[PDB]
Design an enzyme around this catalytic site. Structure first.
Site, PDB file in Angstrom:
ATOM      1  N   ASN A   1       1.042  -1.181  -0.060  1.00 45.26           N
ATOM      2  CA  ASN A   1       0.043   0.079   0.129  1.00 45.26           C
ATOM      3  C   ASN A   1       1.038   1.208  -0.080  1.00 45.26           C
ATOM      4  O   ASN A   1       2.068   1.030   0.578  1.00 45.26           O
ATOM      5  CB  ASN A   1      -0.848   0.061   1.113  1.00 45.26           C
ATOM      6  CG  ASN A   1      -0.557  -0.627   2.419  1.00 45.26           C
ATOM      7  OD1 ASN A   1       0.098  -0.139   3.255  1.00 45.26           O
ATOM      8  ND2 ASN A   1      -0.819  -1.798   2.572  1.00 45.26           N
TER       9      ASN A   1
ATOM     10  N   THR B   1      -8.410  -0.933  -0.251  1.00 39.40           N
ATOM     11  CA  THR B   1      -8.199  -2.187   0.183  1.00 39.40           C
ATOM     12  C   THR B   1      -9.293  -3.026  -0.881  1.00 39.40           C
ATOM     13  O   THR B   1     -10.069  -2.230  -1.415  1.00 39.40           O
ATOM     14  CB  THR B   1      -8.916  -2.461   1.621  1.00 39.40           C
ATOM     15  OG1 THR B   1      -8.524  -3.875   1.612  1.00 39.40           O
ATOM     16  CG2 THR B   1     -10.239  -2.511   1.563  1.00 39.40           C
TER      17      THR B   1
ATOM     18  N   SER C   1      -7.100   1.350   2.246  1.00 41.02           N
ATOM     19  CA  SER C   1      -6.277   0.296   2.697  1.00 41.02           C
ATOM     20  C   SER C   1      -6.393  -0.321   4.147  1.00 41.02           C
ATOM     21  O   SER C   1      -6.785   0.672   5.040  1.00 41.02           O
ATOM     22  CB  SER C   1      -4.807   0.563   2.843  1.00 41.02           C
ATOM     23  OG  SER C   1      -4.029  -0.291   3.158  1.00 41.02           O
ATOM     24  N   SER C   2      -6.388  -1.426   4.537  1.00 44.14           N
ATOM     25  CA  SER C   2      -6.754  -1.698   5.986  1.00 44.14           C
ATOM     26  C   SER C   2      -5.553  -1.432   6.870  1.00 44.14           C
ATOM     27  O   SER C   2      -5.862  -1.297   8.104  1.00 44.14           O
ATOM     28  CB  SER C   2      -6.805  -3.426   5.795  1.00 44.14           C
ATOM     29  OG  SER C   2      -5.372  -3.918   5.205  1.00 44.14           O
ATOM     30  N   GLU C   3      -4.374  -1.096   6.034  1.00 49.27           N
ATOM     31  CA  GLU C   3      -3.321  -0.472   7.083  1.00 49.27           C
ATOM     32  C   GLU C   3      -2.966   0.937   6.892  1.00 49.27           C
ATOM     33  O   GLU C   3      -1.979   1.484   6.963  1.00 49.27           O
ATOM     34  CB  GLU C   3      -1.928  -1.370   6.434  1.00 49.27           C
ATOM     35  CG  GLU C   3      -2.112  -2.654   6.340  1.00 49.27           C
ATOM     36  CD  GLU C   3      -1.045  -3.426   6.300  1.00 49.27           C
ATOM     37  OE1 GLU C   3      -0.130  -3.687   7.368  1.00 49.27           O
ATOM     38  OE2 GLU C   3      -0.601  -4.057   5.526  1.00 49.27           O
TER      39      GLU C   3
ATOM     40  N   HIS D   1       4.645   0.814   2.006  1.00 47.06           N
ATOM     41  CA  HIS D   1       4.689  -0.309   2.705  1.00 47.06           C
ATOM     42  C   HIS D   1       4.700  -1.477   1.941  1.00 47.06           C
ATOM     43  O   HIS D   1       3.692  -1.603   1.177  1.00 47.06           O
ATOM     44  CB  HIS D   1       3.682  -0.108   3.580  1.00 47.06           C
ATOM     45  CG  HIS D   1       3.228  -1.397   4.476  1.00 47.06           C
ATOM     46  ND1 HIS D   1       4.351  -2.191   5.197  1.00 47.06           N
ATOM     47  CD2 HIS D   1       2.324  -2.171   4.557  1.00 47.06           C
ATOM     48  CE1 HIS D   1       3.634  -3.076   5.741  1.00 47.06           C
ATOM     49  NE2 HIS D   1       2.446  -3.117   5.312  1.00 47.06           N
TER      50      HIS D   1
ATOM     51  N   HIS E   1       5.464  -6.174   1.727  1.00 47.66           N
ATOM     52  CA  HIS E   1       5.814  -7.351   2.538  1.00 47.66           C
ATOM     53  C   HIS E   1       6.656  -8.097   1.778  1.00 47.66           C
ATOM     54  O   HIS E   1       6.878  -9.050   1.570  1.00 47.66           O
ATOM     55  CB  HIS E   1       4.638  -8.227   2.700  1.00 47.66           C
ATOM     56  CG  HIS E   1       3.578  -7.789   3.823  1.00 47.66           C
ATOM     57  ND1 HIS E   1       2.265  -8.339   3.854  1.00 47.66           N
ATOM     58  CD2 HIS E   1       3.224  -6.517   4.294  1.00 47.66           C
ATOM     59  CE1 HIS E   1       1.271  -7.706   4.471  1.00 47.66           C
ATOM     60  NE2 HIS E   1       2.091  -6.538   5.044  1.00 47.66           N
TER      61      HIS E   1
ATOM     62  N   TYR F   1      27.957   0.397   2.783  1.00 47.50           N
ATOM     63  CA  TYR F   1      27.808   1.836   3.195  1.00 47.50           C
ATOM     64  C   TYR F   1      26.341   2.430   2.640  1.00 47.50           C
ATOM     65  O   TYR F   1      26.189   3.656   3.169  1.00 47.50           O
ATOM     66  CB  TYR F   1      29.102   2.633   2.506  1.00 47.50           C
ATOM     67  CG  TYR F   1      28.906   2.871   1.194  1.00 47.50           C
ATOM     68  CD1 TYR F   1      29.219   1.663   0.171  1.00 47.50           C
ATOM     69  CD2 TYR F   1      28.468   3.778   0.442  1.00 47.50           C
ATOM     70  CE1 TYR F   1      29.307   1.973  -1.160  1.00 47.50           C
ATOM     71  CE2 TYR F   1      28.269   3.952  -0.975  1.00 47.50           C
ATOM     72  CZ  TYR F   1      28.601   3.075  -1.640  1.00 47.50           C
ATOM     73  OH  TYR F   1      28.684   3.374  -3.013  1.00 47.50           O
TER      74      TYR F   1
ATOM     75  N   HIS G   1       6.093  -8.894   9.935  1.00 45.51           N
ATOM     76  CA  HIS G   1       5.132  -8.381   9.158  1.00 45.51           C
ATOM     77  C   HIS G   1       5.850  -7.744   7.847  1.00 45.51           C
ATOM     78  O   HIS G   1       5.311  -8.292   6.645  1.00 45.51           O
ATOM     79  CB  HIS G   1       4.675  -7.304   9.970  1.00 45.51           C
ATOM     80  CG  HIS G   1       3.607  -6.378   9.358  1.00 45.51           C
ATOM     81  ND1 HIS G   1       2.568  -5.824  10.007  1.00 45.51           N
ATOM     82  CD2 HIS G   1       3.415  -6.155   7.979  1.00 45.51           C
ATOM     83  CE1 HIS G   1       1.956  -5.218   9.058  1.00 45.51           C
ATOM     84  NE2 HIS G   1       2.332  -5.496   7.929  1.00 45.51           N
TER      85      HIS G   1
ATOM     86  N   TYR H   1      27.110  15.848  -1.074  1.00 45.71           N
ATOM     87  CA  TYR H   1      26.784  15.595  -2.616  1.00 45.71           C
ATOM     88  C   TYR H   1      25.266  15.235  -2.753  1.00 45.71           C
ATOM     89  O   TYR H   1      24.330  15.845  -1.986  1.00 45.71           O
ATOM     90  CB  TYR H   1      27.572  14.413  -3.126  1.00 45.71           C
ATOM     91  CG  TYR H   1      29.380  14.834  -3.291  1.00 45.71           C
ATOM     92  CD1 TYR H   1      30.102  14.769  -2.022  1.00 45.71           C
ATOM     93  CD2 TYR H   1      29.786  14.919  -4.582  1.00 45.71           C
ATOM     94  CE1 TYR H   1      31.167  14.828  -1.903  1.00 45.71           C
ATOM     95  CE2 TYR H   1      31.186  15.361  -4.561  1.00 45.71           C
ATOM     96  CZ  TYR H   1      32.030  15.303  -3.248  1.00 45.71           C
ATOM     97  OH  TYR H   1      33.291  15.524  -3.470  1.00 45.71           O
TER      98      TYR H   1
HETATM   99 ZN   LIG Z   1      29.871   1.727  -6.099  1.00 46.89          ZN
HETATM  100 ZN   LIG Z   2       1.352  -5.041   5.882  1.00 47.85          ZN
END
Ligand SMILES: [Zn+2]
Ligand SMILES: [Zn+2]
Ligand SMILES: [Zn+2]
Ligand SMILES: [Zn+2]
Lengths: 209, 209, 209, 209
Positions: free
Chosen positions: A29, A43, A71-73, A92, A94, A113, A155, A209
């Protein structure tokens, strides 16, 4: 910056998210900051049937437009926006590697890095709470205080940034870091990391940068 | 061999690199030897928005064209060209298996006869130094002395060759070797290798054909 | 069944092989039985530049057509045809899971009932010998005596069948079995297998249907 | 809801199943409940050559239409329909992660809250029996009693639901759970799970929404 344009970008972001292999199980979502609240995906509608008209507006009080189910979330998307004023978009999903790391309940440490892209020397893992609850929303809000992305135990992932493009990019980069950590964790424990000094240099270099 | 043709090949090489799954995290950069310096990809522009005009010329003194920002990692592309006079193209990416092997700080040994494609019986791993620094450039230059590809600790891969086609091919082959090494390393340590004599035969056979 | 038709199928088989993810590193080669020898892919030409005219005829004496260079691995394709009279097509690749299992020098045992597709209760691993040699050809010939596919130590896979379609299908199925074996081997050693009696039932059932 | 429409959906489901990477080895088969029996995919025809006319009707007595050979695994599709009256579609495949978990003969426990999609706190693994037998059909029928999906030991997966769209979705979600379980199992044994209370809350929440 009319509602329709933001709505097309949400949908494009879903499609790209699925192309990249991050939307396994149709569970993601996506939201953007808008007016006094946000625009989020609905949803129940498969990502490929989505049209501009399906996108749901939710105000700052948590009331959603009539006739549309967000969405349910949606609740932790609203937690993200109140906890990080600079965030304008939230992704978001999964995604499998992020989620496997969240099942172990570990934070991802400085094995690469690029970890500095989310703001510090790690990617945290917020404790579990039932999806859609106010308790889950508080853990997410505390985790995003000094980081732009977090794992959610048992989750998945939440990533936020100044626009959808950057939020997708970050979400994807965290999936790459997650996969790097699980691949090396199976060989050696613990995994070699870069020092805090080294990450502080990279952080300054990214500011520059 | 006008600048525009080389510029299209750089861009085509980026796209193919992303298709092959080697440009995870939008982190790669590609260069070709040209005039007294090189043509390299710019920093900040997504690979899919790239046009011929975005490619940046950097002279042999390290001065880049006015108004264009070259890759943030241009310095070790210039190190490659000064260390290996026969190299005409350089591919750098953060491909997941190569990078996981570089996190362990190991060199890839002779687990497969195709290892000889990079010049000897192994793929080295150059010690870490902050990206964009002169110190990183010296490790890369020493590592490419007798090899056409190297891992960079906590970072990724650099591969060079006589043209972009071959440089992409080699980069891809090193990702395959990296994946073979991590898959077998999780089962047994150490992994069975071919002897130095055996690799010397294959090397001669590759010279011949 | 003119030469051109067989030639198009070879090329289509290469493309499908690359689509399926089995031709990692541009290393595969494909042949079909024809006249007194075979039609095989050439060495040096990328699969996407291939045309009907590039396919090379090699007679039963091992002499190839003038002006065309056959695959550097043509010799064991000719070993396959002399060892298994029923084989009319041969697929060889360096697919990652098959090759990782060949680095361990293990045969794939009966972890899945589809193992019976190659003829018995296992997929053998022929001992290493330098590519292109008569010694490699003898190991391959002995390994294909009672099996339609074999791993080659530190190298890759060879699969043969009555036509290209079935040979590709088998090669792909062995890559799936290889991946099943490496995924479960990392968890438990040894991996649970089906008994010889059970495989004999499945073999009879495959004869029937 | 004429036969032809259901037939197109079966074929579309096969294609999507292959796109998703779940139909490795060309082994899947798909059915829908229809009249007094079912419509199922035929044996022997590659998914890409399938047309509406190839779909096979099998009545409630197990007699199939004249001149068409149904899948070699049709019998447990008929077991599914008799064991779960609410099921209107059945998807079966040999997806790699599901199958690797079935080789270990383990059930997938509650490592993720989405486990509740198949009906409880786990994904069972039915004991092995030869494909196409009445004995395999009885294990499948007992396993689907209180679950909408099951693993089959040394074999693969069966998922059922109210329509093809949902059955594909569930099959895919079980492959994701399987991959989450094998990735974390290689790191730690046993893998952290959610409690039975926690899964009972999620189950109620899924009933509600
Ligand atoms: Zn590189
Ligand atoms: Zn989720
Ligand atoms: Zn080979
Ligand atoms: Zn099956």
């Amino acid at each position: 910056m009319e509602r329709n344009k933001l709505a097309r970008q949400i949908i494009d972001t879903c499609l790209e998210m699925t192309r990249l292999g991050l939307n396994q199980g149709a569970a993601g979502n996506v939201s953007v900051r808008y007016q006094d609240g946000m625009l989020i995906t609905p949803t129940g509608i498969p990502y490929e049937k989505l049209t501009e008209s399906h996108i749901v507006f939710i105000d700052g009080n948590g009331k959603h437009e009539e006739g549309k189910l967000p969405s349910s979330e949606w609740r932790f998307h609203m937690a993200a926006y109140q906890s990080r004023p600079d965030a304008n978009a939230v992704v978001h999903n999964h995604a499998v590697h992020c989620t496997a790391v969240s099942i172990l309940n570990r934070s991802i440490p400085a094995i690469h890095y690029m970890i500095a892209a989310a703001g510090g020397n790690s990617i945290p893992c917020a404790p579990y709470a039932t999806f859609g609850t106010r308790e889950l929303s508080e853990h997410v809000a505390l985790a995003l205080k000094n980081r732009k992305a977090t794992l959610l135990q048992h989750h998945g992932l939440i990533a936020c940034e100044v626009n959808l493009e950057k939020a997708l990019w970050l979400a994807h980069e965290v999936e790459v870091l997650a996969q790097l950590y699980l691949t090396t964790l199976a060989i050696t424990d613990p995994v070699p990391v870069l020092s805090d000094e080294e990450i502080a240099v990279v952080l300054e270099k990214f500011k520059t940068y």
